[PDB]
Scaffold this motif. Structure first.
Motif, PDB file in Angstrom:
ATOM      1  N   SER A 142      16.247 -16.765  13.225  1.00  0.00           N
ATOM      2  CA  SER A 142      14.994 -16.113  12.895  1.00  0.00           C
ATOM      3  C   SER A 142      14.013 -16.492  13.969  1.00  0.00           C
ATOM      4  O   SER A 142      14.148 -17.553  14.562  1.00  0.00           O
ATOM      5  CB  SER A 142      14.463 -16.612  11.563  1.00  0.00           C
ATOM      6  N   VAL A 143      13.051 -15.630  14.270  1.00  0.00           N
ATOM      7  CA  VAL A 143      12.065 -16.012  15.265  1.00  0.00           C
ATOM      8  C   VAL A 143      11.178 -17.072  14.600  1.00  0.00           C
ATOM      9  O   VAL A 143      10.352 -17.697  15.245  1.00  0.00           O
ATOM     10  CB  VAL A 143      11.231 -14.834  15.759  1.00  0.00           C
ATOM     11  N   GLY A 144      11.362 -17.255  13.297  1.00  0.00           N
ATOM     12  CA  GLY A 144      10.634 -18.278  12.574  1.00  0.00           C
ATOM     13  C   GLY A 144      11.316 -19.610  12.863  1.00  0.00           C
ATOM     14  O   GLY A 144      10.962 -20.647  12.320  1.00  0.00           O
ATOM     15  N   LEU A 149       5.147 -20.692  11.628  1.00  0.00           N
ATOM     16  CA  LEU A 149       4.343 -19.668  10.958  1.00  0.00           C
ATOM     17  C   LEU A 149       3.648 -20.263   9.754  1.00  0.00           C
ATOM     18  O   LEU A 149       4.271 -20.939   8.936  1.00  0.00           O
ATOM     19  CB  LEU A 149       5.236 -18.503  10.491  1.00  0.00           C
ATOM     20  N   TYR A 155      10.422 -23.261   5.529  1.00  0.00           N
ATOM     21  CA  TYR A 155      11.336 -22.227   5.971  1.00  0.00           C
ATOM     22  C   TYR A 155      11.575 -22.397   7.474  1.00  0.00           C
ATOM     23  O   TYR A 155      12.723 -22.387   7.920  1.00  0.00           O
ATOM     24  CB  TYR A 155      10.768 -20.840   5.663  1.00  0.00           C
ATOM     25  N   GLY A 186      13.932 -10.586  13.688  1.00  0.00           N
ATOM     26  CA  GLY A 186      12.511 -10.507  13.424  1.00  0.00           C
ATOM     27  C   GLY A 186      12.554 -10.032  11.979  1.00  0.00           C
ATOM     28  O   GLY A 186      13.524 -10.328  11.265  1.00  0.00           O
ATOM     29  N   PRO A 187      11.533  -9.319  11.498  1.00  0.00           N
ATOM     30  CA  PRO A 187      11.571  -8.843  10.109  1.00  0.00           C
ATOM     31  C   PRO A 187      12.515  -7.627   9.973  1.00  0.00           C
ATOM     32  O   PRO A 187      12.546  -6.748  10.840  1.00  0.00           O
ATOM     33  CB  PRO A 187      10.117  -8.467   9.853  1.00  0.00           C
ATOM     34  N   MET A 193      11.629  -8.148   0.179  1.00  0.00           N
ATOM     35  CA  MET A 193      10.883  -9.099   1.004  1.00  0.00           C
ATOM     36  C   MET A 193       9.379  -8.936   0.809  1.00  0.00           C
ATOM     37  O   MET A 193       8.681  -9.903   0.485  1.00  0.00           O
ATOM     38  CB  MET A 193      11.226  -8.927   2.490  1.00  0.00           C
ATOM     39  N   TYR A 218      -2.958 -14.369   5.014  1.00  0.00           N
ATOM     40  CA  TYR A 218      -1.642 -14.383   5.645  1.00  0.00           C
ATOM     41  C   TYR A 218      -0.755 -13.292   5.071  1.00  0.00           C
ATOM     42  O   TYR A 218      -0.003 -12.655   5.806  1.00  0.00           O
ATOM     43  CB  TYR A 218      -0.940 -15.743   5.498  1.00  0.00           C
ATOM     44  N   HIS A 221      -1.747  -9.887   6.456  1.00  0.00           N
ATOM     45  CA  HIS A 221      -1.251  -9.784   7.829  1.00  0.00           C
ATOM     46  C   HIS A 221       0.273  -9.620   7.885  1.00  0.00           C
ATOM     47  O   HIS A 221       0.806  -8.894   8.731  1.00  0.00           O
ATOM     48  CB  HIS A 221      -1.681 -11.029   8.614  1.00  0.00           C
ATOM     49  N   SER A 222       0.964 -10.318   6.996  1.00  0.00           N
ATOM     50  CA  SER A 222       2.415 -10.270   6.923  1.00  0.00           C
ATOM     51  C   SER A 222       2.879  -8.846   6.593  1.00  0.00           C
ATOM     52  O   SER A 222       3.810  -8.326   7.220  1.00  0.00           O
ATOM     53  CB  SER A 222       2.891 -11.267   5.866  1.00  0.00           C
ATOM     54  N   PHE A 259       8.545  -9.976  19.975  1.00  0.00           N
ATOM     55  CA  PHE A 259       8.022 -11.323  19.775  1.00  0.00           C
ATOM     56  C   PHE A 259       8.208 -12.255  20.966  1.00  0.00           C
ATOM     57  O   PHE A 259       7.774 -13.407  20.934  1.00  0.00           O
ATOM     58  CB  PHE A 259       8.610 -11.940  18.501  1.00  0.00           C
ATOM     59  N   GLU A 282      -4.720 -14.643  15.467  1.00  0.00           N
ATOM     60  CA  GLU A 282      -3.996 -13.427  15.117  1.00  0.00           C
ATOM     61  C   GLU A 282      -3.729 -13.299  13.627  1.00  0.00           C
ATOM     62  O   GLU A 282      -3.660 -12.188  13.097  1.00  0.00           O
ATOM     63  CB  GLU A 282      -2.663 -13.374  15.865  1.00  0.00           C
TER      64      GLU A 282
HETATM   65  C1  LIG Z   1      10.356 -15.198  10.204  1.00  0.00           C
HETATM   66  C2  LIG Z   1      10.332 -13.628  10.042  1.00  0.00           C
HETATM   67  C3  LIG Z   1      10.251 -12.993  11.453  1.00  0.00           C
HETATM   68  C4  LIG Z   1       8.857 -13.150  12.103  1.00  0.00           C
HETATM   69  C5  LIG Z   1       7.690 -12.565  11.247  1.00  0.00           C
HETATM   70  C6  LIG Z   1       6.272 -12.669  11.898  1.00  0.00           C
HETATM   71  C7  LIG Z   1       6.114 -12.757  13.304  1.00  0.00           C
HETATM   72  C8  LIG Z   1       4.843 -12.947  13.868  1.00  0.00           C
HETATM   73  C9  LIG Z   1       3.708 -12.800  13.072  1.00  0.00           C
HETATM   74  O1  LIG Z   1       2.484 -12.618  13.667  1.00  0.00           O
HETATM   75  C10 LIG Z   1       3.825 -12.831  11.670  1.00  0.00           C
HETATM   76  C11 LIG Z   1       5.109 -12.707  11.071  1.00  0.00           C
HETATM   77  C12 LIG Z   1       5.199 -12.627   9.518  1.00  0.00           C
HETATM   78  C13 LIG Z   1       6.637 -12.374   8.936  1.00  0.00           C
HETATM   79  C14 LIG Z   1       7.716 -13.133   9.771  1.00  0.00           C
HETATM   80  C15 LIG Z   1       9.169 -13.048   9.154  1.00  0.00           C
HETATM   81  C16 LIG Z   1       9.497 -13.626   7.753  1.00  0.00           C
HETATM   82  C17 LIG Z   1      11.054 -13.563   7.716  1.00  0.00           C
HETATM   83  C18 LIG Z   1      11.504 -13.132   9.147  1.00  0.00           C
HETATM   84  O2  LIG Z   1      12.812 -13.694   9.503  1.00  0.00           O
END
Ligand SMILES: C[C@]12CC[C@@H]3c4ccc(O)cc4CC[C@H]3[C@@H]1CC[C@@H]2O
Ligand SMILES: C[C@]12CC[C@@H]3c4ccc(O)cc4CC[C@H]3[C@@H]1CC[C@@H]2O
Lengths: 284, 284
Positions: A142-144, A149, A155, A186-187, A193, A218, A221-222, A259, A282
């Motif tokens: 995950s980019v997380g 975040l 997580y 990414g998402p 979700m 948050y 924004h999410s 990302f 952001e």
């Molecule tokens: C970490 C995730 C990818 C990156 C996403 C992101 C990436 C950058 C940002 O500005 C906010 C978010 C919110 C939701 C995030 C996601 C939640 C699950 C997914 O794997």
């Protein structure tokens, strides 16, 4: 027979989508073992399998609870081919909310499942792959797991953990001929979700009005990012196949490139200041 | 009274060295609560305290087991000043050996202590700091939390975990006035460190002769780096003080600059290929 593939967490998400994508492949070269924690959730998998008309015998479901080494070993015995060519460590849990509002057992479960669970799988399947001098392990990243975040503290902890566990093994496995790759998602379009996110009162009585107000910001924004950037499971699942087929795979495969700029400013400044500032501005 | 500081894992290492360094400070401005898992190991701390002639009442020892939220809460009640200005999350465990040779409980303990333990501390102490609008949390990092190292799979997992947990909180805490910093330590002169490393037979019957041979090579290389680069605990402990005194602290403080070039090539290539190759060639 064929290229035996074993995947964890196939009751939904990319796991389910990846199993049927493999089992239904035109070349019919993959035998798939889709494992689920609870077999009573195998419905979706089967309905999806029938939807893609998967040939009989290309898909098998096993109950595998990654939180139990006894479950991991038993499932390993059910693999009739007595060999696993591609192991996909996908099982995972998410956790949202202010750190102080998260129950201890919840935090313990995410690590147990996301991190240790992957450790239990590798301990059981890595030895044999080294002895054969071949195997492929794909791990759902995950980019997380590449940047922190807000409100996803534990997580990101678990995903950052996979990055470290994997980079370490990679350095060692290079000579053994077994490949290990992380798929940085990414998402991905998961209606569930965007519906899991959202907790008023329960969170409110376990935090302060200012953190709560930030949680709301948050979440808002999410929802935007998900809507404007969530990818199709078919697009993501195909990346798993690109990695899976690469002759000399890299340690990381990114399903999206949006990302990457935010990740660059994260290293140009190792002190973490620029990133923490940019991400706050952001998100808030 | 004074700046109340609470540190975890003070029976040796930088923890013990940091407690006495603070308590013995010429300005006499820090009241120190050095916690230990087992009080029967408080000898070293006291002997070191007497060696630096720490004024009576500047150092107090509390038994605190980070694996137990009940221990964490009780210790929190022993803080007579009823306030903690600086929390130093230092307690930690290391783990060496091939992934397949590590017992499940050992892996579970390192995460429980290193990661969850830090989660238990923050949940107990973060709320109050946000309510006051001030506080400082310093966390003991490792460059093993910034890059993966062979044979330290689970150790790096836990340190990478802290990086993610902390970067996330940082983004959220920015407005609350509470600061959070990670102190990235390289190797620090710990004779016990270079003596813990070294496990023949026991490891051999739980892995293969080729991984074993690689473990040996890694140990040889590890001994070199430690000898040619281990820092004095006094040098490291002072970094904790630089962070602690900074008006606007950064998210990361590096105790040494020698490992920074190897970290740069780690981002110039997000696919992880260059790094995995460079680290393998250097270690084997
Ligand atoms: C970490 C995730 C990818 C990156 C996403 C992101 C990436 C950058 C940002 O500005 C906010 C978010 C919110 C939701 C995030 C996601 C939640 C699950 C997914 O794997
Ligand atoms: C991760 C540590 C810092 C980085 C060290 C390193 C750094 C680079 C390298 O080539 C090998 C090693 C071996 C020992 C490592 C250390 C073990 C404990 C210490 O915190």
């Amino acid at each position: 027979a064929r290229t035996v593939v074993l995947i964890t967490g196939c009751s939904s998400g990319i796991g389910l989508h990846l199993a049927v994508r493999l089992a239904s492949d035109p070349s019919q070269s993959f035998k798939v073992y889709a494992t689920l924690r609870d077999l009573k959730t195998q419905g979706r998998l089967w309905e999806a399998a029938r939807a893609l008309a998967c040939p009989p015998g290309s898909l098998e479901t096993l109950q595998l609870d990654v939180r139990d080494s006894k479950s991991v070993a038993a499932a390993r015995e059910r693999v009739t081919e007595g060999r696993v060519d591609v192991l996909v460590c996908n099982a995972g849990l998410g956790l949202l909310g202010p750190l102080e509002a998260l129950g201890e057992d919840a935090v313990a479960s995410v690590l147990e499942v996301n991190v240790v669970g992957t450790v239990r799988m590798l301990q059981a399947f890595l030895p044999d792959m080294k002895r054969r001098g071949s195997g492929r392990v794909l791990v759902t990243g995950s980019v997380g797991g590449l940047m922190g975040l807000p409100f996803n503290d534990v997580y990101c902890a678990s995903k950052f953990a996979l990055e470290g566990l994997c980079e370490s093994l990679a350095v060692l496995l290079l000579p053994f001929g077994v490949h290990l790759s992380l798929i940085e998602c990414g998402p991905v379009h998961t209606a569930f979700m965007e519906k899991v996110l959202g907790s008023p009162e329960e969170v409110l009585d376990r935090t302060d009005i200012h953190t709560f107000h930030r949680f709301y910001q948050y979440l808002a924004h999410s929802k935007q990012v998900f809507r404007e950037a969530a990818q199709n499971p078919e697009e993501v699942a195909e990346v798993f196949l690109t990695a899976l087929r690469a002759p000399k795979p890299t340690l990381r495969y990114f399903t999206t490139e949006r990302f990457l700029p935010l990740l660059r400013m994260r290293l140009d400044d190792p002190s973490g200041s620029n990133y923490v500032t940019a991400m706050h501005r952001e998100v808030f």
